[PDB]
Swiss-Prot record:
Subunit structure and binding partners: Heterotetramer, composed of two GyrA and two GyrB chains. In the heterotetramer, GyrA contains the active site tyrosine that forms a transient covalent intermediate with DNA, while GyrB binds cofactors and catalyzes ATP hydrolysis.
Other noteworthy facts: Few gyrases are as efficient as E.coli at forming negative supercoils. Not all organisms have 2 type II topoisomerases; in organisms with a single type II topoisomerase this enzyme also has to decatenate newly replicated chromosomes.
Subcellular location(s) per record: Cytoplasm
Organism, as annotated: Staphylococcus aureus
Task of the protein: A type II topoisomerase that negatively supercoils closed circular double-stranded (ds) DNA in an ATP-dependent manner to modulate DNA topology and maintain chromosomes in an underwound state. Negative supercoiling favors strand separation, and DNA replication, transcription, recombination and repair, all of which involve strand separation. Also able to catalyze the interconversion of other topological isomers of dsDNA rings, including catenanes and knotted rings. Type II topoisomerases break and join 2 DNA strands simultaneously in an ATP-dependent manner.
Protein name: DNA gyrase subunit B
Length: 194
């Protein structure tokens, strides 16, 4: 209703109108860029000194799940928007705007908080769903086929090459890639340079 929500909605419209100006293209390259946008957040949180494990999973139907053991995206009610910080951050995310569905689970304050979105729009208010003794952020997203019209299927080797490189370039971070798309044949590569 307020000036805040208005700018968020205009922001989503702008990203979906010209996706290639935000992520380079809507080809297979652009699809893979979505993963790097999320993963780069976890890398920064590790470099800041608050995380050291990152897991990227290619799930059934080419959902992507990214999990870190950082502090967790904050959930406190923000001054600007009057909404949880996590909601504000994710409603301005290009990955969220270009995903048909996105989910977040924040582990923080010994609590698990959950919110879901479609094309960047929150589907309900941030909800406490359980408790935890760890901190971290889990992001699950499904790329929007309306945007990524060529393909929404990830290439394991493409993710693997860059994930390995990230681990090599950011020594000490454990980065794991797992492909669960075929439950009968699951592949996993784990990188941890010392
Ligand atoms: C997958 C993933 N991980 C993160 C992440 O770790 N974000 C950090 C950003 C800094 N955070 C903060 N922590 C404490 C106070 C204020 C903060 N902040 O400014 O967001 C913790 C989460 C964002 C996303 Br997608
Ligand atoms: Mg509570
Ligand atoms: Mg380590």
């Amino acid at each position: 209703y307020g000036a805040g929500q208005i700018q968020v909605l205009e922001g989503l419209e702008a990203v979906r109108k010209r996706p290639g100006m935000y992520i380079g293209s809507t080809s297979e390259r652009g699809l893979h860029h979505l993963v790097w946008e999320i993963v780069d957040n976890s890398i920064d949180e590790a470099l800041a000194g608050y995380a050291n494990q990152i897991e990227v999973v290619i799930e059934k139907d080419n959902w992507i799940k990214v999990t870190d053991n950082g502090r967790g995206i904050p959930v406190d009610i923000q001054e600007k928007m009057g909404r949880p910080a996590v909601e504000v951050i994710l409603t301005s995310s290009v990955v969220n705007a270009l995903s048909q569905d996105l989910e977040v689970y924040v582990h923080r304050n010994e609590t698990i908080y959950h919110q879901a979105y479609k094309k960047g729009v929150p589907q309900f208010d941030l909800k406490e769903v359980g408790t935890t003794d760890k901190t971290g952020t889990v992001i699950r997203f499904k790329a929007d086929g309306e945007i990524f019209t060529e393909t929404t299927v990830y290439n394991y080797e493409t993710l693997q090459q860059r994930i390995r490189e990230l681990a090599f370039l950011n020594k000490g971070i454990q980065i794991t890639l797992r492909d669960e798309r075929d439950e009968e044949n699951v592949r996993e590569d784990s990188y941890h340079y010392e």
